[PDB]
Structures are given as structure tokens and as C-alpha cells.
Amino acid sequence: YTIAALLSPYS
Amino acid sequence: YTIAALLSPYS
Amino acid sequence: YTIAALLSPYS
Amino acid sequence: YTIAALLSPYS
Amino acid sequence: YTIAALLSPYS
Amino acid sequence: YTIAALLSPYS
Amino acid sequence: YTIAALLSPYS
Amino acid sequence: YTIAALLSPYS
Amino acid sequence: YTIAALLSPYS
Amino acid sequence: YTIAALLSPYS
Amino acid sequence: YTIAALLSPYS
Amino acid sequence: YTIAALLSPYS
């Protein structure tokens, strides 16, 4: 399989 | 609040 | 020939 | 889960 | 505060 | 699948 | 399997 | 002549 | 899931 | 007999 | 299956 | 007598 995810949650 | 979540469950 | 197979895969 | 299976294959 | 919760999740 | 979650966030 | 055979060949 | 033969081949 | 099977039974 | 088969199953 | 037979009976 | 026979049975 192939997966690419980016998450930059700021407060 | 701040939340970031990713889930890619495969069978 | 003779064959008997059972499969109950759950997610 | 619950599973019940019986197989009596004869030649 | 007052909170009451019950959870019995079965597979 | 089986999931059970409870959240009561107060300010 | 099940087989039953009889042969009495005379000359 | 006299001949008697039986063959029951199964797969 | 992923499955690959080949069968060439001859008599 | 003659048989030729190729299988490249990926997940 | 494969079979080859030859018979030349003379009297 | 004279007899000539050839058989090449392949599977």
C-alpha cells in the first residue's frame, strides 16, 4: 500500500 | 482546542 | 475429489 | 463473534 | 460538575 | 470493528 | 467409495 | 479364449 | 487482502 | 504436459 | 491418460 | 509372418 499525510495543528 | 488525526485501516 | 472449506473473515 | 460450522466430506 | 457514563462495546 | 468513546469537555 | 464385482470366467 | 476384467478408476 | 492461485489438474 | 503461469499479487 | 497397444494374433 | 508397428504415446 501507499499512504502520505501531513498535519500541522497549532493552538 | 486543536486536534489532528489520520487513520487508513485496510483489510 | 472431495473438498470442504469454510471461511468467515471479519473486519 | 460467534461461529459454528461442521463439515464431513467423504470420498 | 456531575457525569455518569457506561460503555460496553463488544466485537 | 468496535469503538466506544465519551467526551464531556467544559469551559 | 464402494465397489463389489464378481467374475468367474471358464474355458 | 476366456477373459474377465473390471476397472473402476475414479478421480 | 491479496491472493493468487493457479491449479491445472489433469487426469 | 506443458504449463506456464506467472502471478505477482501485491498488497 | 495415454495408452498405446498393438496385437496381431494369428491362428 | 511379418509385422512392423511403432507407437510413441505421450502424456
PDB file of all heavy atoms in Angstrom, chain I:
ATOM      1  N   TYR I   1      -7.314  -7.697   1.084  1.00  0.00           N
ATOM      2  CA  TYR I   1      -6.433  -8.893   1.005  1.00  0.00           C
ATOM      3  C   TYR I   1      -5.932  -9.116  -0.418  1.00  0.00           C
ATOM      4  O   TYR I   1      -6.440  -8.514  -1.364  1.00  0.00           O
ATOM      5  CB  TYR I   1      -7.223 -10.119   1.482  1.00  0.00           C
ATOM      6  CG  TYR I   1      -7.778  -9.994   2.887  1.00  0.00           C
ATOM      7  CD1 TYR I   1      -9.063 -10.432   3.185  1.00  0.00           C
ATOM      8  CD2 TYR I   1      -7.020  -9.441   3.911  1.00  0.00           C
ATOM      9  CE1 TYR I   1      -9.577 -10.321   4.465  1.00  0.00           C
ATOM     10  CE2 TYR I   1      -7.525  -9.329   5.191  1.00  0.00           C
ATOM     11  CZ  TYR I   1      -8.804  -9.769   5.461  1.00  0.00           C
ATOM     12  OH  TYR I   1      -9.311  -9.659   6.737  1.00  0.00           O
ATOM     13  N   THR I   2      -4.942  -9.988  -0.561  1.00  0.00           N
ATOM     14  CA  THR I   2      -4.376 -10.302  -1.865  1.00  0.00           C
ATOM     15  C   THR I   2      -4.091 -11.793  -1.985  1.00  0.00           C
ATOM     16  O   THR I   2      -3.392 -12.366  -1.151  1.00  0.00           O
ATOM     17  CB  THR I   2      -3.074  -9.519  -2.122  1.00  0.00           C
ATOM     18  OG1 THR I   2      -3.206  -8.174  -1.647  1.00  0.00           O
ATOM     19  CG2 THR I   2      -2.736  -9.508  -3.604  1.00  0.00           C
ATOM     20  N   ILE I   3      -4.645 -12.419  -3.016  1.00  0.00           N
ATOM     21  CA  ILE I   3      -4.453 -13.849  -3.226  1.00  0.00           C
ATOM     22  C   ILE I   3      -4.336 -14.199  -4.706  1.00  0.00           C
ATOM     23  O   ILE I   3      -5.087 -13.697  -5.539  1.00  0.00           O
ATOM     24  CB  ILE I   3      -5.609 -14.668  -2.615  1.00  0.00           C
ATOM     25  CG1 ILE I   3      -5.483 -14.706  -1.093  1.00  0.00           C
ATOM     26  CG2 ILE I   3      -5.617 -16.081  -3.182  1.00  0.00           C
ATOM     27  CD1 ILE I   3      -6.687 -15.308  -0.401  1.00  0.00           C
ATOM     28  N   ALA I   4      -3.398 -15.085  -5.010  1.00  0.00           N
ATOM     29  CA  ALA I   4      -3.180 -15.546  -6.375  1.00  0.00           C
ATOM     30  C   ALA I   4      -2.868 -17.038  -6.376  1.00  0.00           C
ATOM     31  O   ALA I   4      -1.885 -17.469  -5.777  1.00  0.00           O
ATOM     32  CB  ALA I   4      -2.051 -14.765  -7.029  1.00  0.00           C
ATOM     33  N   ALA I   5      -3.710 -17.831  -7.027  1.00  0.00           N
ATOM     34  CA  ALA I   5      -3.510 -19.273  -7.071  1.00  0.00           C
ATOM     35  C   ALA I   5      -3.884 -19.863  -8.426  1.00  0.00           C
ATOM     36  O   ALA I   5      -4.885 -19.482  -9.026  1.00  0.00           O
ATOM     37  CB  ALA I   5      -4.308 -19.948  -5.967  1.00  0.00           C
ATOM     38  N   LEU I   6      -3.076 -20.808  -8.895  1.00  0.00           N
ATOM     39  CA  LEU I   6      -3.327 -21.464 -10.171  1.00  0.00           C
ATOM     40  C   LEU I   6      -3.264 -22.982 -10.009  1.00  0.00           C
ATOM     41  O   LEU I   6      -2.357 -23.506  -9.370  1.00  0.00           O
ATOM     42  CB  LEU I   6      -2.314 -20.998 -11.224  1.00  0.00           C
ATOM     43  CG  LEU I   6      -1.036 -21.835 -11.322  1.00  0.00           C
ATOM     44  CD1 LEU I   6      -1.121 -22.792 -12.501  1.00  0.00           C
ATOM     45  CD2 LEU I   6       0.183 -20.936 -11.447  1.00  0.00           C
ATOM     46  N   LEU I   7      -4.239 -23.679 -10.581  1.00  0.00           N
ATOM     47  CA  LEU I   7      -4.285 -25.135 -10.489  1.00  0.00           C
ATOM     48  C   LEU I   7      -4.746 -25.756 -11.804  1.00  0.00           C
ATOM     49  O   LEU I   7      -5.848 -25.486 -12.275  1.00  0.00           O
ATOM     50  CB  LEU I   7      -5.210 -25.566  -9.341  1.00  0.00           C
ATOM     51  CG  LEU I   7      -6.177 -24.493  -8.835  1.00  0.00           C
ATOM     52  CD1 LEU I   7      -7.584 -25.057  -8.716  1.00  0.00           C
ATOM     53  CD2 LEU I   7      -5.706 -23.943  -7.500  1.00  0.00           C
ATOM     54  N   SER I   8      -3.902 -26.605 -12.392  1.00  0.00           N
ATOM     55  CA  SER I   8      -4.239 -27.272 -13.645  1.00  0.00           C
ATOM     56  C   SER I   8      -4.138 -28.789 -13.488  1.00  0.00           C
ATOM     57  O   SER I   8      -3.214 -29.415 -14.005  1.00  0.00           O
ATOM     58  CB  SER I   8      -3.317 -26.794 -14.764  1.00  0.00           C
ATOM     59  OG  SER I   8      -3.853 -25.651 -15.410  1.00  0.00           O
ATOM     60  N   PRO I   9      -5.096 -29.405 -12.761  1.00  0.00           N
ATOM     61  CA  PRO I   9      -5.111 -30.854 -12.535  1.00  0.00           C
ATOM     62  C   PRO I   9      -5.622 -31.631 -13.743  1.00  0.00           C
ATOM     63  O   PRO I   9      -6.708 -31.360 -14.253  1.00  0.00           O
ATOM     64  CB  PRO I   9      -6.069 -31.008 -11.359  1.00  0.00           C
ATOM     65  CG  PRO I   9      -7.023 -29.873 -11.503  1.00  0.00           C
ATOM     66  CD  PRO I   9      -6.236 -28.734 -12.105  1.00  0.00           C
ATOM     67  N   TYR I  10      -4.831 -32.600 -14.202  1.00  0.00           N
ATOM     68  CA  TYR I  10      -5.212 -33.410 -15.353  1.00  0.00           C
ATOM     69  C   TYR I  10      -5.389 -34.870 -14.961  1.00  0.00           C
ATOM     70  O   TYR I  10      -4.779 -35.348 -14.003  1.00  0.00           O
ATOM     71  CB  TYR I  10      -4.157 -33.303 -16.459  1.00  0.00           C
ATOM     72  CG  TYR I  10      -3.763 -31.884 -16.816  1.00  0.00           C
ATOM     73  CD1 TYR I  10      -2.493 -31.605 -17.295  1.00  0.00           C
ATOM     74  CD2 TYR I  10      -4.658 -30.827 -16.682  1.00  0.00           C
ATOM     75  CE1 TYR I  10      -2.120 -30.321 -17.633  1.00  0.00           C
ATOM     76  CE2 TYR I  10      -4.293 -29.537 -17.017  1.00  0.00           C
ATOM     77  CZ  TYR I  10      -3.025 -29.292 -17.491  1.00  0.00           C
ATOM     78  OH  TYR I  10      -2.659 -28.012 -17.830  1.00  0.00           O
ATOM     79  N   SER I  11      -6.225 -35.579 -15.715  1.00  0.00           N
ATOM     80  CA  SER I  11      -6.481 -36.988 -15.455  1.00  0.00           C
ATOM     81  C   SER I  11      -5.760 -37.863 -16.474  1.00  0.00           C
ATOM     82  O   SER I  11      -6.391 -38.249 -17.480  1.00  0.00           O
ATOM     83  CB  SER I  11      -7.985 -37.270 -15.489  1.00  0.00           C
ATOM     84  OG  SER I  11      -8.329 -38.317 -14.598  1.00  0.00           O
TER      85      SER I  11
END
